[PDB]
Amino acid sequence: MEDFVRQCFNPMIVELAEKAMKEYGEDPKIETNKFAAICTHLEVCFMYSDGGSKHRFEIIEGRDRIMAWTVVNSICNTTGVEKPKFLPDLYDYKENRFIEIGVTRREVHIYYLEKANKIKSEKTHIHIFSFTGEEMATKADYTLDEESRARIKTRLFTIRQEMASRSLWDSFRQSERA
Ligand SMILES: [Mn+2]
Ligand SMILES: [Mn+2]
Fold first, then answer.
1. Which of 4, 59, 121, 150 is the most exposed place for a label (fewest CB within 10 A)?
2. How many whole angstroms from 74 Cα to the centroid of ligand 1?
3. Is 178 helix (H, G, I), strand (E, B) or coil?
4. From ligand 2's centre to the CA of 1, what distance in Å?
């Protein structure tokens, strides 16, 4: 799986994932499913931010904590949107709302509720993807066009298929915890 991750994801995503794991004392060479999951999540966030009009989204995920909060606080100050308790993933300048993105190995509805429960926000939009083509977004409002969403859904399916071909998928699929 470590070899899979390093050949599947671009070096910027892999570096960010390694850093995120080491910040919690986790070794990417040992907790390789986690390594894969973090990379997938980052890749989805960046894909999502590329799917709108130029300048539609601000990326928050993947930034160091200080810069992430600087971005969040700046946006809150200039738009008056409520300050979230936890860092979200993106800000949507069109809809004027923060976005929390999730990618799940279980099922989109359970992950959606867990995420709703964690952030406890009246205002932050949630969008969840699976590796088998399901999605689930707050108020069935999927933000992006069918084409952009299809690209994300296809990418995750492709990752799943590659894992399966290497006999990595069944361990990976069963590795997410409530
Ligand atoms: Mn995040
Ligand atoms: Mn997220």
1. 150
2. 18
3. coil
4. 22
Cα 105 to the chain's mean position, in Å?
A: 13
Please tell me what resolution, in angstroms, this structure has. 2.0
Domain regions of the chain by residue span: 1-178
Q: Which fold, 1-178?
A: Restriction Endonuclease (3.40.91)
Cα distance between residue 138 and residue 124, in whole Å: 9
- Counting ligands in written order, the one closest to the CA of 44 is 2
Q: List the end-to-end C-alpha distance of the chain, in Å, as a whole number.
A: 22
Our measurement of the distance from residue 11's CA atom to the centroid of its chain's CA atoms, rounded to an integer in Å, reads 17
Q: Do strands 90-92 and 125-130 pair parallel, antiparallel, or not at all (unpaired)? A: unpaired
- CB contact at 8 A, 135 and 108: yes
CA–CA separation, 159 and 140 (whole Å): 25
| d(CA 30, ligand 1 centre) in Å | 23
Quickly list DSSP for 62-91: TS-HHHHHHHHHHHHHHH-PPPPSS--SEE
Q: How was this structure determined?
A: X-ray
**Catalytic residue list:** 115
